[PDB]
Amino acid sequence: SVLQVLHIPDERLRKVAKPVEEVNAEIQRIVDDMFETMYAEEGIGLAATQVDIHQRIIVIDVSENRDERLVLINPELLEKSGETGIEEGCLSIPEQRALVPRAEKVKIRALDRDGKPFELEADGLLAICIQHEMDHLVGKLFMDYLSPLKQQRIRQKVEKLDRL
Numbered sequence: 001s002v003l004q005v006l007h008i009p010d011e012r013l014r015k016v017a018k019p020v021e022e023v024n025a026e027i028q029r030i031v032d033d034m035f036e037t038m039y040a041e042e043g044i045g046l047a048a049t050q051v052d053i054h055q056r057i058i059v060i061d062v063s064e065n066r067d068e069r070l071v072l073i074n075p076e077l078l079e080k081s082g083e084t085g086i087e088e089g090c091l092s093i094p095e096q097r098a099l100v101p102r103a104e105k106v107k108i109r110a111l112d113r114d115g116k117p118f119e120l121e122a123d124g125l126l127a128i129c130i131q132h133e134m135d136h137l138v139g140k141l142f143m144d145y146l147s148p149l150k151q152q153r154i155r156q157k158v159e160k161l162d163r164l
């Protein structure tokens with residue numbers, strides 16, 4: 001069911017997620033509830049923190065359709081390398097796009113929604129995306145890598161839309 005995605009001025013967005021002790025049916029309900037909200041909100045990746053569930057659960061799908069669903073439960077960063085930047089956005093940060101320093105390649109390990117351990121070697125957009133989401137699980141926002149002046153402007157610009 002489409003859940004409410006928290007927007008910028010919200011401390012809940014700055015909460016560090018607590019691990020999934022056991023991926024059970026309830027967890028799998030969540031995973032699915034997320035993918036719906038991501039598709040509804042028309043996003044490419046979403047972290048549990050943005051919908052208030054404070055656990056290390058991340059859903060992604062960088063494919064054109066709804067084909068390649070990617071589930072990251074308890075992700076662990078194994079490697080990084082290189083640097084790149086995309087003018088990226090966030091569903092919790094309405095309409096504000098910005099370039100941010102990111103790794104070029106990244107190697108992770110996590111559990112799928114079945115609870116099985118897997119390993120990924122994302123590069124390119126998928127890398128940029130996994131990195132962006134994982135930050136969420138530690139309450140870290142992309143706008144955090146900006147100058148205080150820009151954070152102010154962003155935050156400020158976003159608020160007006162929220163009252164509208």
Ligand SMILES: [Zn+2]
Pocket residue numbers: 089090091092132133136
């Ligand atoms: Zn985001």
